[PDB]
Chains A and B, each alone.
Chain A
Amino acid sequence: GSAYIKVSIQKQAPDIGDLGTVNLFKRPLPKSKPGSPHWQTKLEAAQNVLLCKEIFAQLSREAVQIKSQIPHIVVKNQIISQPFPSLQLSISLCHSSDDK
């Protein structure tokens, strides 16, 4: 599929669910009209999404990490954190493959 990295410093958010992460319009990205090997584009997109998988797997390892001076909740795809009570966190990702 395809992935997208996005961070948003909002005010705050509770443990709720709504029209949050990318909708059916998953990750609007360059059409890439310039002539290039389409198979190579698919290949590099797969490499990119695997990189996103790896970086998210590494970032997920924070609950068992040093839990001091930075308390933070973490769930699947959501790592919303409160370093200061002004900014927000939880860089997210999606899979732009489930849309015919």
Chain B
Amino acid sequence: LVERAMKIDHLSIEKLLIDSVHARAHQRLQELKAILRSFNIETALPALIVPILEPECLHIFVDLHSGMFQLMLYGLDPATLEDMEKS
């Protein structure tokens, strides 16, 4: 957690930015995982992962440049998950 991969400056401007946004995105992902676990999951390196069944589907990631973290469940029903995204 010591400014992961960008603790030292003087490498590149973008480095500190990506470091900060990645740390904060992981923080928000862990926060989401917290409420998910309190209801009744795991995570990964880029973003979090949440299952829907008990066997693959329902992957959710984060926008490294802005809010409104996107998500895409392999399958059908387009232009409808966008409402979930907004919510």
Contacts and interface: CB of A to CB of B under 8 A. Distances in A.
A64 interface: yes
Given A63-B65, A64-B65, A67-B65, A15 B70 contact: no
B4 A73 contact: no
Interface residues of B, number: 19
A16 interface: yes
A12 B44 CA distance: 12
B4 to A, nearest CB: 7
User: Which of A64, A67, A82 has the largest number of chain B CB atoms within 10 A?
Assistant: A67
Contact of B12 (A14, A64, A76): A76
B62 A71 contact: yes
List the 8 closest pairs (A to B, CB-CB), nearest first. Answer: A71-B61, A15-B5, A63-B65, A75-B14, A73-B64, A69-B72, A67-B63, A14-B45
Interface of B: 4-5, 12, 14-15, 18-19, 22, 45-47, 61-66, 70, 72
Given A15-B5, A16-B5, 14 more contacts: A14-B5, A14-B45, A15-B4, A63-B64, A67-B65, A67-B70, A69-B70, A69-B72, A71-B46, A71-B63, A73-B46, A75-B12, A75-B18, A82-B46
11 contacts: A12-B45, A14-B5, A63-B64, A67-B63, A67-B66, A67-B70, A71-B62, A71-B64, A73-B18, A73-B64, A75-B14
